[model samples]
Target: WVVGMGIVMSLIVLAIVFGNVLVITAIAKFERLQTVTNYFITSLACADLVMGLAVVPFGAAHILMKMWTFGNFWCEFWTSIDVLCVTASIWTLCVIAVDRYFAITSPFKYQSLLTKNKARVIILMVWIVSGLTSFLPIQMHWYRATHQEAINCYAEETCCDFFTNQAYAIASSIVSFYVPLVIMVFVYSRVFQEAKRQLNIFEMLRIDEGLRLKIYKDTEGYYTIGIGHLLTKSPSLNAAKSELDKAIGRNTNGVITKDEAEKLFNQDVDAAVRGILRNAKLKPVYDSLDAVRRAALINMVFQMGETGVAGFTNSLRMLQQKRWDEAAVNLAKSRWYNQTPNRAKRVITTFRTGTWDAYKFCLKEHKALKTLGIIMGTFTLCWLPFFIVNIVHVIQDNLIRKEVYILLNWIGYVNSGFNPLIYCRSPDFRIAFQELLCL
Candidate 1:
């Protein structure tokens, strides 16, 4: 069983490393994938890598020995490291969920709010909060004491055990797990509903009739108010046999042929038509800017998703009412809070280089919940078990000191890798890591 667990764990680690690395790279290299939300993902990945490095190799030794050969100081040191990184990982995810929710539900103020610099600040705070958590409890002896003969001594058993008290265990569980789980349940349920609406499965069911229609109507009233029906079934997006050519991108006479449509649009004609609404609405804003840098910056903000003006900037209504403060406040509350320092520097450099453009792309509707669903599901599956086990162990409170410490180590083990691969995969990180010569 131990050998099997080791093989499974090794494979899981490998998959996480490669998968997250690819994800981060894909987002970074492709300009189309860069967004404020992706920034949080990138941050999460970095934390995962850190935890992996700090905990993994030495972990097996710690578990197998069942004692602290490394001394009490090292035990405290490792626990401190785990606490900081784990808290940051979970906090960043919660922020990502809220950010995506705002982007989908509101599109107007998204650009002003979701900048690169702000994301950096939030991420920094997450780390800082994690660090503070480690120091205050351990340094202050809120955890176990430094006494040698006590159960928490430098012995193999109690060395790495941070959760010395049932109270501490439950507290950590509530803050890191249950509360976040509840919020995720509510948020993800809405997110899936929104994703289904994006796929228009409800509309398809409506056309199938009888039992299908009954099932369709049940979901209709649930999501009818928000789904994009007119746009999905427009003349340009038809999928009927008589309209196959049209759906395939033919001309009005249905004689243009597939290649001709692709040549004209440089894409699938039917998909292009279905995409036309977004394109038509977006062109004017992007076209206003002549500078490429300015356009790219604006496009980055737009692609990451946005809170609508009403929810974010209130720009239109603000202009109508001449309420500048309200407008700015709206923008401030948007993803503007998520921007990082690195992102700010790039935008600032562009501005300093005199690449200002009159046209600004504030928000491009990015079928939100659908694109982000799998990412959330990945975390839910990976981390939720550790959280459950921790709660169970804390409540039962019957294990020997050595056994308890090992279980705590297992909880920390789950923190070691891969959340970031769900969002950002950039070459800059590799180049930076190489510059520092990390193996």
Candidate 2:
């Protein structure tokens, strides 16, 4: 952020300086452009130029560096200059608004009344007023919060925020922004109204109502606003957040990318964390539990609701006693095991292992994928010799003897019996094959 953002932000300083410089330059050089309006504009350009020079760069430094590295004097200097430029700009805007409105409303009458000398005095007074507002409060300690300071910046590792007392804040806000904003609003309204009244009529275009992206349901049907984002109770106007709008349906294709879909699960996991931590019995212990244990708990809370997990009283008790193996046993016997055995099995598997390995919903293959690979490899190895001999014999009648053929055939025959041994790689498969027997 500091490197790339600092480079990008520095360009804004260049832009402001360049634009304001041109404004003042044009007014000074061109006799035709030197009018009462341009005189006020020249002052505004100077105010903004000072802003570009001192105020904005210091602010950018403090924001991006996020500390007041410059000592107390520079801090105060920057602070006063920032306020001076901002207030000057604001007053310029207000004064410019009045001059333009008068020009439009009383064109001939206004031009004769306002002179360059009068405009010069008004601009000078605006700057002086701005300087007093900015410097007086800081230097005299009128604006600082009740806490007290002349408090040096360099001594502190983190320093410099502009905080004002309540009275100063309210007073400055109303004077600097609120009243000026309202004044400009009314001035512009009247100015525009006068123009429309004079002209009486005009043509305008823009017929279409506009693009309104509509809502659609998700697979689970919870009033989805877009593909995956669930809808809110009421329509919201902000473009940033997804929400339902007047357009209720658009038969548009939507994709749920796998990566974000898992992030969607993590989103639910946070909701589950909120659920689990809110419960009295689970929280204190949850705080002390290891990472995988928390992962397993949240997994359960995801599959079974938090309330559903809470009903596993015996299993929860076993967990509280720190009996990982017994907790596994206790969970296995629950009716939830029968109802959602694969999901439950993964949770129990996670508990006993007390590790991340079993956290995968292991029944995705459970033991099937492992056993298939092992048996396939061994079966291929045992049968290939016999098939190779058969292919060679087909090239000519007597490529190999019946003795070698019989031995290779017998080697291939052993593959059927050896598969039970291959099943030994999986614990549950081994258990069933050895203990449960062929029956």
Candidate 3:
């Protein structure tokens, strides 16, 4: 049993070590990926790596020995370190989720909010809080009644864990888990819905119906001829048939051929697409966008008609302003997106990520990102106030125990380390890692 557990734990430690190391190296080495977001990711990796380095080996050793053979000093040290690591990990996850939420929802504003100096301050807080939680509780005897043996010391048949201290344990759990989880849930729920809404707009815009080869009547009782090609006056039916036959191969006896009809259909689609773009007054904007974007916009106008396209006044303005994210979001919020969710999601993701199939794009759209963001944010937010209150009380009471405070502060601050685990779930990271290592 001991050997088996040891092997399992050793693998877990190895996995943690390998994964974090790769993430740290990838971000550190890739200048392009080194944004404020990636900085948080790097911090997460460093924290987790610290666990592998400082905490897990000791844990594995203890597991293998089936006893805490380390001295009292080491035991105390490890307990402090354990809390520090976990606290830091949880807090970091919360920060990362919040960061992603803004980046996705209000991308233009994200840079202003998450400036370099602000990011530095946030990172500093992660370390400061981590130290307070781990070191102060253990060193100041906050984890004990001062009536019991030290929590988890060497040479003990029974080990005392952090949970034994009711107040400390509860506070720790709230700060480390519950509070963050709540924030994550609320914030990410918005993010996912936003993503979904945008994607639905793209779906609505996607042209799928076959174009009319011949003339037809519109809902307004206007004679719309040859796709969107408007007929000022109806031409002779024989004359139209002669033109169609010349363009799409001759059809005798007034019956249309499937092959010729398909050719006419394509011609009509192009004519309709051009007509819609012109009628929507999007020619200037249409020229600026890529072929795909033009196709999408034209298709949207084609379905909704000029009036429907005109309804997107703000979105069109944003597009003209080259505010891609805003335009994309605006497009998503329309009735069209709500009416067609699945297709809109893909289109919205494409716009948000700005690549058809980039690594970071895949990561941005990963369902796990939404899930973890909510889960982690909610857990952290729930208990954070309780933890802060304790800290405030500690300050007010003038409980100035330096070593314990320093240790707890370390525990609190290192919360920056946990988010890499979440980030690694992105397929893009795997691609980057593979590219980096040539694996």
* Best prediction by lDDT: 3
Question: What lDDT tens digits, residue by residue, belong to model 1 across residues 1-439?
Answer: 6777677556656655665565556556656556787778777776666566665545655655555566667677777776766677667767777766665455442232567888888888877876787656766667653345445343554456444656666776677566766686677676445433332212221211111100011122321101111112233323322443334444443233434332433222233223323544433433443343323334233223222312332433442343534543543344533543333333333333433222111112333343455555666676676666666766674644546555555555564444443332234344433433345
TM-score of each: 0.51, 0.43, 0.54
Model 1: what TM-score?
Answer: 0.51
**Candidate 3, residue 200: CA error in Å?**
7.3
lDDT string for model 2 (202-258, tens) is 000000011123444333444443223444434342422332222223222333334
User: What TM value does model 2 have?
Assistant: 0.43
Root-mean-square deviation per candidate: 18.5, 35.9, 14.7
lDDT score of model 2? 0.58
Q: Decide which is better by lDDT, 2 or 3.
A: 3
* Comparison by lDDT, 1 against 2, better one: 2
Candidate 1 Cα outliers beyond 4 Å, as residue runs: 1-30, 108-113, 145-158, 195-368, 399-439
Candidates 1 and 3 compared by lDDT, better number:
3
From the highest lDDT down, the ranking of the candidates is: 3, 2, 1
Q: Give all candidates' CA lDDT scores.
A: 0.49, 0.58, 0.59
Clash counts for all predictions: 33, 0, 52
